[PDB]
Amino acid sequence: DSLAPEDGSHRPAAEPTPPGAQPTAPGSLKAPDTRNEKLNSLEDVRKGSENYALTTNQGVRIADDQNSLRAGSRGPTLLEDFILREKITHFDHERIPERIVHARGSAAHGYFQPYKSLSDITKADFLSDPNKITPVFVRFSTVQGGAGSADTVREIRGFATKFYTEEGIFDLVGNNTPIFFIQDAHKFPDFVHAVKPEPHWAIPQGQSAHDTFWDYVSLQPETLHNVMWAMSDRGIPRSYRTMEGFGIHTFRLINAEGKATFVRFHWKPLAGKASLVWDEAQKLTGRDPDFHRRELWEAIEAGDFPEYELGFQLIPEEDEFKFDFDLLDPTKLIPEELVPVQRVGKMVLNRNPDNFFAENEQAAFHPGHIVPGLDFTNDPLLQGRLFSYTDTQISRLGGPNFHEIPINRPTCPYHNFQRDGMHRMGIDTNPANYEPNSINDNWPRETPPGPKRGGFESYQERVEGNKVRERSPSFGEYYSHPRLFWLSQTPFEQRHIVDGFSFELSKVVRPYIRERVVDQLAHIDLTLAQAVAKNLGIELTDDQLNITPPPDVNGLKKDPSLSLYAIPDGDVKGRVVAILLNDEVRSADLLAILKALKAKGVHAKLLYSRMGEVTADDGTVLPIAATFAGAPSLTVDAVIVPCGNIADIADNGDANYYLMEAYKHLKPIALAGDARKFKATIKIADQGEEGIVEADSADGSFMDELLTLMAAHRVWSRIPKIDKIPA
Amino acid sequence: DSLAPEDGSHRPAAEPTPPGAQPTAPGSLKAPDTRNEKLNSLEDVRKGSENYALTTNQGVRIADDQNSLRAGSRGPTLLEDFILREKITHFDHERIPERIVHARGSAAHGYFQPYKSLSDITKADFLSDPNKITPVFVRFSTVQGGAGSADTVREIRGFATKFYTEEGIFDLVGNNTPIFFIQDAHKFPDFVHAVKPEPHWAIPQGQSAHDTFWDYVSLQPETLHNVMWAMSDRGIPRSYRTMEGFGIHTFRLINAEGKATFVRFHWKPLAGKASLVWDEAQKLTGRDPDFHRRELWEAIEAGDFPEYELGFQLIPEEDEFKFDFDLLDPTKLIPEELVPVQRVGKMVLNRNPDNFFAENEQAAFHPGHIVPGLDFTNDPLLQGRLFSYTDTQISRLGGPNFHEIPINRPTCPYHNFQRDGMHRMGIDTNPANYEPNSINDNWPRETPPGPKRGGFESYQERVEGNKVRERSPSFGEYYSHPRLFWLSQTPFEQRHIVDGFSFELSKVVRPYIRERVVDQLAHIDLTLAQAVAKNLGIELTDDQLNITPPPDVNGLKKDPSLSLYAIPDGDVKGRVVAILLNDEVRSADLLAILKALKAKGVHAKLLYSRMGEVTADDGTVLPIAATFAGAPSLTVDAVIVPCGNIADIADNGDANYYLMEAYKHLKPIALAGDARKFKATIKIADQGEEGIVEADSADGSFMDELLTLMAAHRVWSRIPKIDKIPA
Numbered sequence A, B: 001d002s003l004a005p006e007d008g009s010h011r012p013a014a015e016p017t018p019p020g021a022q023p024t025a026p027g028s029l030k031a032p033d034t035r036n037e038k039l040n041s042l043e044d045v046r047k048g049s050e051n052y053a054l055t056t057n058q059g060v061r062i063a064d065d066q067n068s069l070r071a072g073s074r075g076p077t078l079l080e081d082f083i084l085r086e087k088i089t090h091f092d093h094e095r096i097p098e099r100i101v102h103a104r105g106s107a108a109h110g111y112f113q114p115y116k117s118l119s120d121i122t123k124a125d126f127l128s129d130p131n132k133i134t135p136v137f138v139r140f141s142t143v144q145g146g147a148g149s150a151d152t153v154r155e156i157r158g159f160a161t162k163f164y165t166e167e168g169i170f171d172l173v174g175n176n177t178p179i180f181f182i183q184d185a186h187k188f189p190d191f192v193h194a195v196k197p198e199p200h201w202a203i204p205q206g207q208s209a210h211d212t213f214w215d216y217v218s219l220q221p222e223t224l225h226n227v228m229w230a231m232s233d234r235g236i237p238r239s240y241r242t243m244e245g246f247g248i249h250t251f252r253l254i255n256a257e258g259k260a261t262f263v264r265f266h267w268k269p270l271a272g273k274a275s276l277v278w279d280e281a282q283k284l285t286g287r288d289p290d291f292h293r294r295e296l297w298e299a300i301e302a303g304d305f306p307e308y309e310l311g312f313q314l315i316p317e318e319d320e321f322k323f324d325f326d327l328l329d330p331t332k333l334i335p336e337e338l339v340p341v342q343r344v345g346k347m348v349l350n351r352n353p354d355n356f357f358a359e360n361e362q363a364a365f366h367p368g369h370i371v372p373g374l375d376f377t378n379d380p381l382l383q384g385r386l387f388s389y390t391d392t393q394i395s396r397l398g399g400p401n402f403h404e405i406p407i408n409r410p411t412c413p414y415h416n417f418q419r420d421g422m423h424r425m426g427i428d429t430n431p432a433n434y435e436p437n438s439i440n441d442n443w444p445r446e447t448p449p450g451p452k453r454g455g456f457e458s459y460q461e462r463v464e465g466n467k468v469r470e471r472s473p474s475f476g477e478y479y480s481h482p483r484l485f486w487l488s489q490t491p492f493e494q495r496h497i498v499d500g501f502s503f504e505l506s507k508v509v510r511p512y513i514r515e516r517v518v519d520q521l522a523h524i525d526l527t528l529a530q531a532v533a534k535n536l537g538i539e540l541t542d543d544q545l546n547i548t549p550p551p552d553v554n555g556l557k558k559d560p561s562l563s564l565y566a567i568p569d570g571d572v573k574g575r576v577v578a579i580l581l582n583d584e585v586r587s588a589d590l591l592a593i594l595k596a597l598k599a600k601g602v603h604a605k606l607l608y609s610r611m612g613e614v615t616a617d618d619g620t621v622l623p624i625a626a627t628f629a630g631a632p633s634l635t636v637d638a639v640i641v642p643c644g645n646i647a648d649i650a651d652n653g654d655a656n657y658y659l660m661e662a663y664k665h666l667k668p669i670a671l672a673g674d675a676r677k678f679k680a681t682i683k684i685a686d687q688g689e690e691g692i693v694e695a696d697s698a699d700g701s702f703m704d705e706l707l708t709l710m711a712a713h714r715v716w717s718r719i720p721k722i723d724k725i726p727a
């Protein structure tokens, strides 16, 4: 019975459409022509539905899926109802353990290709030829929260890429900041337990704003560098498309000659760097907890494919000890002013998955999954990570056959003597399950290392030392990198770092922990230490005021690539504007607005005080995407109010509040004709203000001004004006 | 090392303390003297820590828990480091599958006691004597969201009680509304899949405001009754302490003489019925996603023990068919005007757990766990539930020995012939593992049914009919219950219902689904259907305007017990007030305010624009709990502003917005002396308005008037005035 509408409006058109224009759908139905070797190889397990009978898992057609079998229509359910028991049994066992960390994440399929051959520095096959494409599957995530927690929390973000290469899977499992909080993997459980919800009551979710986190940080100054990055606006990215990615550790590249080059991996967002502001980010965790998940999915459905440039910081082996920090310490970054990022290739995410659980939830990434041409280093954090990502999926994915789950399967050949395990799919026909064997003439056989298609051989690094549980003395410096980061931020980014620390330490119940953290900031920078202390009602002592600042990092007093905004990198394609309608919209304003937005690939959402439709002055029927309250200004990049019958919305509380929230969060606002009467709500300027576009009508010049503001992301000059506004 | 502060301020006093006064802590350290039989029985597994050496799990003392074992202090980590591998292995497998539904939940320990013996109607031992105390463990929950989702979502809430009786565990697994969405358990996976995050992208979390939910609802009219309850303010409770609890299904009580009485279970909140308003609840999911978990835990630490009265609706076997609805249909409630709730006993929750994972996450409740004196009925939703809750713990809790996990163990004797299974703890010494046996003289033995301490025997209900997969025709009525609920609500409750439907349908992307739900609403009540249609820009057709309304339920046109607020049941103890400080508070106002609140058990939180302290006019040093942005008005029940230097915060945007937010959400606000200058922020007349307390000082009747407002919970008369207001 219950069937599709006559008009076919239940199903999304299979073509690129702007956010909200059609219901979202599984990738293979939304973009059936988008393919790559990995996506094609998943065809053996994709299951359709249209035109097929409803059955049990054993293939028996079901006649009545609305009722249990009972003795009489008001009688007891019978144990012989196997249809009911299979159905409820499968439901009863749907859930698998979520990831220990990074349980909340969003993923997509795409492809990668190098700009030129890197055969002089690496024999890795996926980087050997500019016209050789490698399928990828990428998962972005938060760290602390559960799989059902919110997206726009303040936290480091994960950025994991699975490269399905011809010589094996390579997983590049990184984060959105260039360093980690801790130095040795043995402390991982301590750090993670300290940031996770506290053990007695399991509070708080997705937040480092609580006593145990700041207690750990206060006792472990090695954490201060990554804590600086988390308290800055880097901890609240606007989108997964607008953040950087880093492998953090120094790895090695190995060429066909056997030469090792130290390398740090980078991803540069071709959409530019952009972050929310705290009040915005926190409120958005409640208005739309799935904001980043949704935004990535919709950008891909709209054709705004997330694009990232892979880059390498390369250090010759003979320069291992030439910096004033250890290259193997993951709490230290390598300034781009000392070692530039060489561009390597481009990654494009162009298709969403079909089933989130099957492809995203069960995907398994692991930094140990390297290929010939790559190798590790002794970084003590990376060294212990190698143990954990294989170990954890024995419970998470139920066994050692996790490489047979469709999303994890290599697309290149895989043959060996491993057998059995839970849910074994592969049926081995080799007469032998051991080597050396004569009964199958020793196949499959080992392969000597070589320039291409060779077996994996570890670089023969020289090891000299006693068996010790000891931190290297070279890792014992905790304040110079934090300071380099601080001085490289713009004045408004510095204020937001101060505000992040102040907000988080205000939620620490035990005051001495706050004091201890303030003492640590005084070892980094006294201006920062004093601004935080002032917000906590703390007075620095005379000793604290005399702590000597840490040395500069190799002579650097700042490095602009550490800042999100110092060097302009705005890109408006894929951004979104809210357009506040009225019941008699001036169609000439809307025409000019939409045309200019379209030309720069910026989307719009038409909002009103009710759903349904409104009719413009020329009879155009305008469908409403959402109400003012239903899609708050938190969800858009700018707000435009066209003329028409402004009296209709002039006294609307939500419409006025929409503009006050956008104003507070530093977003560009554009007001045309009678819409300029809303300037009184945002109680400011009469001759106009930088950041507020106004004109008798919406024209080419009005739209050019708005789009120029949007390319600079936010109106930072308005900061001084927002803390009086009651919003 | 000896890291704690010498003043001993790292540790919370072991005595009842108001919310925010000390750091929260494990139940047994916070209230060591609070005991019960179950709490005492868990002492065999409680583990301390103070003064013990740090070890491996095998008991080997660890010397250096800061580093991995490596060859050289900058060398590679060695595989022989078993201390590192055990510690990371345990971390790597910490997580277990979350509950399929009700994954988000907060729990506590308590006790129950009947008011009088109920031996005339049931032989259940826990109900046989007013001096028999039964330990309980209660878990409150949401339904759709994961364990890391937010508390204050719009949804039904779970209310599960484990009764540790002398004759077995009895689990009463109910919800906060008296009916469920569906009639037969076979449809549980369809209904749950429709409400859970959609399968392609796993959005949205914690929300029924999406297409698949409303699609299923539109095609299955049996769901309308519980959907009405969810769309009302019942869907957003202020606290687990202020909501009702229901078993939903008709069960049986069996007495010693073998007589069966039909029974429906109720829990009445002794703190009264109270809910939030949608904008507040939604925003509170961002500002504090753990608000309910937090409020429960803090209530117990403050001595505001959650108290509930167990009540029974009792219906004689001969009256089975005397109502307009089927007693076994879980989508129908039994109006209290037809069958009163008989008061049975009281439950008091008075201790938090020690470890959330061990006691809360691993607890297993199942409605099939009944005891002699209780029995089931043929309700087709309850019949299928009996299969699911034993089945699901085979994956959730790892095996069939889940009754051996400490929190789940019976406190009464358990002996049988069951053996082995994963994680087996009990070591059986019986020579036999089968019966009948002669080798252990048939022990343990079967026990005949009897008045007390007898074996379980099912009531011999007559069963007659053919084996059919058929819904009883008596369940085919879907609109009279929804209509009875609607007519029982106050006018402001009806508006909140209209708003709930309107908001949720506005997030449904496919317009025809909105239209189809509106058509179902037209079968319930025309006023409701017109108001929702108007908010969606939908016009009812002439056919919809003439749909005849469903009949009354057994002659009733309303039942005030269905309303949260029609009949005042206000209780201020355990509520909390925000007090907005300034840098020279009139100490006389604060003395009056705080002492009046304390005499009624109402908590306070002193807020300011920074942390630390402020000094009152007389030199009193005032400790600040949180900033205005740090502890938003969403978290309190009322706001009071004392006189003093009001110029200090008069122009603070946050302080003004604090009042605008509380005013919008209908909370009582009290302004003393010069604090009346904030009247212009919320546009209050010179003469004043009901809901705003104002005077020259906080003396005389100022606090009594504020407390009277708190007793009515919210200022419903202000709704028309908030309509506008930009907040």
Ligand code: HDD
Residues within 6 Å of the ligand: A099, A100, A101, A102, A105, A139, A140, A141, A157, A158, A159, A160, A173, A174, A175, A179, A180, A184, A185, A188, A247, A248, A249, A330, A363, A364, A365, A381, A384, A385, A388, A389, A390, A392, A393, B088, B092
């Ligand atoms: C020693 C243990 C340990 C340490 C020191 C780290 N982590 Fe890790 N991480 C794990 C133990 C692990 C894990 C327990 O193995 C996880 C969750 C389960 C999973 O499959 O892998 C994981 C997941 C995980 C993910 C999610 C992959 C996904 O999307 O499935 C990413 C992005 C990171 N980690 C990144 C980092 C980076 C950049 C680190 C430091 C530089 C780091 N991890 C240190």
Ligand code: HDD
Residues within 6 Å of the ligand: A088, A092, B099, B100, B101, B102, B105, B139, B140, B141, B157, B158, B159, B160, B173, B174, B175, B179, B180, B184, B185, B188, B247, B248, B249, B330, B363, B364, B365, B381, B384, B385, B388, B389, B392, B393
């Ligand atoms: C046939 C399946 C089925 C049906 C029809 C119901 N549920 Fe259920 N529910 C389960 C399948 C289940 C479950 C899969 O077995 C769960 C989840 C995990 C668990 O242990 O139990 C569960 C958990 C569960 C919880 C959580 C207990 C805790 O806190 O752990 C409560 C409060 C409810 N349910 C209440 C209800 C009520 C009042 C129902 C209708 C009257 C309902 N359920 C119908």
